[PDB]
Scaffold this motif. Structure first.
Motif, mmCIF file in Angstrom:
data_model
loop_
_atom_site.group_PDB
_atom_site.id
_atom_site.type_symbol
_atom_site.label_atom_id
_atom_site.label_comp_id
_atom_site.label_asym_id
_atom_site.label_seq_id
_atom_site.Cartn_x
_atom_site.Cartn_y
_atom_site.Cartn_z
ATOM 1 N N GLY A 129 0.798 -1.245 0.000
ATOM 2 C CA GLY A 129 0.000 0.000 0.000
ATOM 3 C C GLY A 129 0.826 1.289 0.000
ATOM 4 O O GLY A 129 0.201 2.369 -0.067
ATOM 5 N N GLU A 130 2.165 1.212 0.033
ATOM 6 C CA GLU A 130 3.071 2.378 0.286
ATOM 7 C C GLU A 130 3.343 3.156 -1.010
ATOM 8 O O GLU A 130 3.084 2.646 -2.126
ATOM 9 C CB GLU A 130 4.463 1.988 0.802
ATOM 10 N N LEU A 131 3.965 4.319 -0.895
ATOM 11 C CA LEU A 131 4.470 4.996 -2.116
ATOM 12 C C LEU A 131 5.973 4.732 -2.254
ATOM 13 O O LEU A 131 6.713 4.962 -1.289
ATOM 14 C CB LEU A 131 4.143 6.482 -2.085
ATOM 15 N N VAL A 132 6.392 4.224 -3.412
ATOM 16 C CA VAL A 132 7.821 4.008 -3.759
ATOM 17 C C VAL A 132 8.139 5.024 -4.831
ATOM 18 O O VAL A 132 7.439 5.047 -5.872
ATOM 19 C CB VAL A 132 8.142 2.590 -4.243
ATOM 20 N N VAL A 133 9.115 5.878 -4.586
ATOM 21 C CA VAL A 133 9.570 6.897 -5.551
ATOM 22 C C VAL A 133 10.931 6.430 -6.057
ATOM 23 O O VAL A 133 11.857 6.245 -5.239
ATOM 24 C CB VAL A 133 9.615 8.313 -4.949
ATOM 25 N N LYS A 134 11.017 6.142 -7.351
ATOM 26 C CA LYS A 134 12.240 5.557 -7.962
ATOM 27 C C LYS A 134 13.013 6.691 -8.618
ATOM 28 O O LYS A 134 12.450 7.505 -9.350
ATOM 29 C CB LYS A 134 11.871 4.440 -8.946
ATOM 30 N N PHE A 135 14.299 6.743 -8.348
ATOM 31 C CA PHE A 135 15.210 7.707 -8.972
ATOM 32 C C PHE A 135 16.094 7.000 -10.003
ATOM 33 O O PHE A 135 16.661 7.731 -10.806
ATOM 34 C CB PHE A 135 15.931 8.429 -7.836
ATOM 35 N N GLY A 136 16.143 5.673 -9.977
ATOM 36 C CA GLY A 136 17.064 4.828 -10.765
ATOM 37 C C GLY A 136 18.494 5.363 -10.739
ATOM 38 O O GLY A 136 19.119 5.367 -9.647
ATOM 39 N N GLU A 137 18.975 5.787 -11.910
ATOM 40 C CA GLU A 137 20.366 6.228 -12.184
ATOM 41 C C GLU A 137 20.274 7.690 -12.623
ATOM 42 O O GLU A 137 21.203 8.194 -13.272
ATOM 43 C CB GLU A 137 21.000 5.314 -13.249
ATOM 44 N N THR A 138 19.155 8.335 -12.284
ATOM 45 C CA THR A 138 18.774 9.692 -12.748
ATOM 46 C C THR A 138 19.356 10.777 -11.818
ATOM 47 O O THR A 138 19.325 11.943 -12.237
ATOM 48 C CB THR A 138 17.245 9.816 -12.879
ATOM 49 N N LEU A 139 19.842 10.436 -10.615
ATOM 50 C CA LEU A 139 20.249 11.466 -9.602
ATOM 51 C C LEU A 139 21.491 12.219 -10.078
ATOM 52 O O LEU A 139 22.365 11.629 -10.696
ATOM 53 C CB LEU A 139 20.438 10.800 -8.236
ATOM 54 N N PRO A 140 21.595 13.546 -9.824
ATOM 55 C CA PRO A 140 22.730 14.354 -10.279
ATOM 56 C C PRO A 140 24.030 13.866 -9.622
ATOM 57 O O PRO A 140 23.990 13.253 -8.571
ATOM 58 C CB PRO A 140 22.387 15.793 -9.882
ATOM 59 N N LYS A 141 25.150 14.034 -10.316
ATOM 60 C CA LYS A 141 26.486 13.677 -9.769
ATOM 61 C C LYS A 141 26.910 14.838 -8.881
ATOM 62 O O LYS A 141 26.873 15.946 -9.367
ATOM 63 C CB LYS A 141 27.468 13.448 -10.922
ATOM 64 N N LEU A 142 27.269 14.598 -7.612
ATOM 65 C CA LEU A 142 27.562 15.717 -6.685
ATOM 66 C C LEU A 142 29.064 16.008 -6.744
ATOM 67 O O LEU A 142 29.855 15.055 -6.805
ATOM 68 C CB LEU A 142 27.131 15.372 -5.257
ATOM 69 N N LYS A 143 29.385 17.291 -6.702
ATOM 70 C CA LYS A 143 30.747 17.826 -6.937
ATOM 71 C C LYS A 143 31.248 18.456 -5.647
ATOM 72 O O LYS A 143 30.977 19.627 -5.378
ATOM 73 C CB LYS A 143 30.686 18.861 -8.070
ATOM 74 N N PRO A 144 32.006 17.703 -4.826
ATOM 75 C CA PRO A 144 32.484 18.260 -3.573
ATOM 76 C C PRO A 144 33.590 19.289 -3.834
ATOM 77 O O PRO A 144 34.261 19.218 -4.881
ATOM 78 C CB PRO A 144 32.996 17.053 -2.806
ATOM 79 N N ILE A 145 33.743 20.200 -2.885
ATOM 80 C CA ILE A 145 34.663 21.371 -2.930
ATOM 81 C C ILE A 145 36.089 20.892 -2.724
ATOM 82 O O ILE A 145 37.040 21.643 -3.045
ATOM 83 C CB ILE A 145 34.249 22.422 -1.887
ATOM 84 N N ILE A 146 36.227 19.744 -2.084
ATOM 85 C CA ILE A 146 37.550 19.173 -1.707
ATOM 86 C C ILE A 146 37.512 17.673 -1.989
ATOM 87 O O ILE A 146 36.496 17.059 -1.644
ATOM 88 C CB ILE A 146 37.854 19.469 -0.227
ATOM 89 N N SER A 147 38.540 17.104 -2.598
ATOM 90 C CA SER A 147 38.552 15.695 -3.091
ATOM 91 C C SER A 147 39.380 14.817 -2.166
ATOM 92 O O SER A 147 39.256 13.566 -2.207
ATOM 93 C CB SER A 147 39.081 15.612 -4.518
ATOM 94 N N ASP A 148 40.172 15.443 -1.295
ATOM 95 C CA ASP A 148 41.080 14.717 -0.394
ATOM 96 C C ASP A 148 40.218 13.745 0.420
ATOM 97 O O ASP A 148 39.223 14.166 1.052
ATOM 98 C CB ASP A 148 41.839 15.707 0.491
ATOM 99 N N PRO A 149 40.540 12.434 0.435
ATOM 100 C CA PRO A 149 39.739 11.446 1.182
ATOM 101 C C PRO A 149 39.786 11.693 2.690
ATOM 102 O O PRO A 149 38.803 11.332 3.378
ATOM 103 C CB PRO A 149 40.345 10.099 0.790
ATOM 104 N N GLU A 150 40.857 12.258 3.233
ATOM 105 C CA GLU A 150 40.938 12.626 4.675
ATOM 106 C C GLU A 150 39.827 13.613 5.038
ATOM 107 O O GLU A 150 39.436 13.716 6.243
ATOM 108 C CB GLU A 150 42.286 13.272 5.002
ATOM 109 N N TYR A 151 39.373 14.369 4.065
ATOM 110 C CA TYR A 151 38.248 15.314 4.303
ATOM 111 C C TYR A 151 36.973 14.593 3.910
ATOM 112 O O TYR A 151 36.008 14.595 4.687
ATOM 113 C CB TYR A 151 38.380 16.550 3.422
ATOM 114 N N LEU A 152 36.916 14.053 2.703
ATOM 115 C CA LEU A 152 35.584 13.723 2.116
ATOM 116 C C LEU A 152 34.956 12.560 2.880
ATOM 117 O O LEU A 152 33.705 12.518 3.031
ATOM 118 C CB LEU A 152 35.735 13.408 0.616
ATOM 119 N N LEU A 153 35.746 11.591 3.333
ATOM 120 C CA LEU A 153 35.180 10.401 3.990
ATOM 121 C C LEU A 153 34.587 10.794 5.360
ATOM 122 O O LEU A 153 33.873 9.948 5.946
ATOM 123 C CB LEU A 153 36.250 9.332 4.126
ATOM 124 N N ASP A 154 34.894 11.977 5.863
ATOM 125 C CA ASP A 154 34.330 12.428 7.152
ATOM 126 C C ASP A 154 33.048 13.222 6.956
ATOM 127 O O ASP A 154 32.444 13.665 7.976
ATOM 128 C CB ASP A 154 35.362 13.273 7.876
#
Ligand SMILES: O=C(COc1ccccc1)Nc1cccc(F)c1
Length: 460
Positions: free
Chosen positions: A377-402
């Motif tokens: 009976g629920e609502l399922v909203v499917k995004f599939g592979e449609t979601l935008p690619k997000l562009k972080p300001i900093i790529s360093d894994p010491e920052y991004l993984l936190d």
């Protein structure tokens, strides 16, 4: 001088019963008394931040600040700096920090919420403080909720009003209430939940307390039972209680619980209860460890005993690279695969997502999802592979993984959020599709779920 990756935080809550404190209150800040107490070998080690919540506080701000600062200076030989102080009626919050932290703390916010309507507006509500500690957002709520054993549903309503309306943290996080704005949120106070046992059992309860046998009392504590039934404080933690009920004592001793009905109580019984509580909610996979949770035994001016809790909390540094802040770092990206939201709503609007994070220059709106009918009976909203690619300001894994991504699912028709949640980037692997999940809430109640996969690219 290195930036810390951990701090300790003291949380105190005390309903002072409209009476001035005694001369010495150091046992509170030392986490000494009953329950989970702090080791004597730590007594001279200052906490990084002290957050003091009072209720029924009869003092001026100046009077209480002088007591608190002189208390800490006696313990630690450190003169603490005042971060913030905010009072609503007789409900007060004070935040003090080591002087070495003065240029690590910024974006200080204060607010209050008045609960109730007409008859029930005028003394209950909450105060709060938020700030940034380097890269980490911290929120603190001191609430004095509705009293009385037969008003648990009012207390639950007070809680929802406070989390809806308390305006702390980053106002750009517009779909999110305080339960999603902070790396670490501490909520404490005279929450006023009672032990729900018959009045006739008062002396039996007292007996149990004298034997330090709390199990048959805690199984009737209204806060634990309402939390287990998901009626309040959804997705918050509380340390196990191993101290005696902190209310209602005869003043000037701790030898007697004063539970019987009196004109002064509105002819209400006050069976011994854990009115005075500390709870917390931290973002997924951030370090937070409770290192004390207890009550003092030697502060007896009030009909409540003070409660202390202390925490180790993970913090991050204010990261700069040659690219971000002030541009993207094209060596970083966040992708979502096979994502869907499951919503409890009856509505049939189209929905879209918003992704919010301090690792993005600004929030990101998705395209609308594809609504399907779920089997039950629920609502399922499917995004599939449609979601935008997000562009972080900093790529360093010491920052991004936190970092963390806040997600809001919004109606296309009204732009109102139907659900909010949070995804950690502290993944088992980069460049690898991995399952992600968050519950979704709105006004702090469960409204659905968001699940899918993530693929995180760092500079490494
Ligand atoms: O501005 C302030 C807070 O000072 C006030 C001013 C008025 C009332 C209460 C406090 N900065 C500050 C920043 C970081 C650490 C710290 F310990 C203090």
């Amino acid at each position: 001088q290195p930036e810390p990756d951990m701090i300790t935080i003291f949380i105190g809550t005390w309903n002072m019963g409209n009476a001035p404190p005694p001369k010495k209150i150091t046992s509170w800040f030392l986490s000494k008394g009953q329950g989970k107490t702090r080791d004597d070998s730590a007594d001279y080690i200052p906490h990084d931040i002290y957050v003091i919540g009072t209720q029924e506080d009869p003092l001026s701000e100046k009077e209480w600040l002088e007591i608190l600062k002189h208390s800490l200076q006696e313990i630690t030989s450190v003169t603490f700096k005042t971060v913030a102080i905010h009072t609503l009626w007789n409900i007060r919050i004070v935040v003090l920090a080591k002087p070495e932290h003065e240029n690590r703390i910024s974006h200080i916010c204060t607010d209050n919420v008045k609960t109730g309507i007409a008859n029930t507006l005028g003394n209950k509500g909450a105060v709060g403080v938020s700030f940034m500690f380097n890269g980490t957002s911290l929120g603190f709520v001191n609430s004095h909720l509705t009293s009385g054993s037969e008003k648990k549903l009012r207390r639950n309503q007070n809680y929802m009003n406070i989390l809806r309306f308390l305006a702390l943290g980053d106002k750009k996080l517009s779909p999110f209430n305080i339960t999603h704005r902070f790396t670490h949120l501490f909520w404490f106070g005279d929450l006023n939940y009672r032990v729900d046992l018959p009045t006739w059992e008062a002396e039996t309860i007292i007996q149990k307390i004298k034997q330090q046998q709390y199990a048959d009392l805690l199984s009737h504590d209204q806060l634990l039972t309402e939390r287990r039934e998901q009626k309040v404080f959804l997705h918050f933690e509380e340390e196990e209680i191993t101290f005696a009920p902190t209310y209602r004592f005869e003043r000037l001793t701790r030898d007697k619980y004063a539970y019987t009905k009196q004109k002064a109580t509105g002819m209400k019984y006050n069976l011994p209860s854990w009115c005075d509580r500390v709870l917390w909610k931290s973002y997924p996979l951030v370090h937070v460890v409770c290192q004390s949770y207890g009550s003092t035994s030697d502060i007896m001016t009030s009909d409540h005993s003070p409660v202390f809790a202390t925490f180790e909390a993970g913090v991050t540094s204010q990261f700069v690279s040659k690219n971000g802040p002030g541009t993207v770092d094209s060596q970083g990206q966040i992708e979502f695969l096979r994502c869907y939201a499951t919503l409890k709503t009856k509505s049939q609007t189209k929905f879209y997502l918003e992704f919010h994070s301090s690792c993005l220059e600004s929030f990101v709106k998705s395209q609308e999802g594809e609504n399907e009918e779920g089997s039950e009976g629920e609502l399922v909203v499917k995004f599939g592979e449609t979601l935008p690619k997000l562009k972080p300001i900093i790529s360093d894994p010491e920052y991004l993984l936190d970092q963390h991504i806040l997600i809001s699912i919004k109606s296309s028709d009204s732009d109102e959020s139907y659900g909010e949640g949070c995804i950690a980037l502290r993944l088992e692997a980069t460049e690898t599709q991995l399952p992600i999940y968050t519950p979704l809430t709105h006004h702090g109640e469960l409204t659905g779920h968001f699940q899918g996969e993530i693929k995180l690219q760092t500079s490494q």
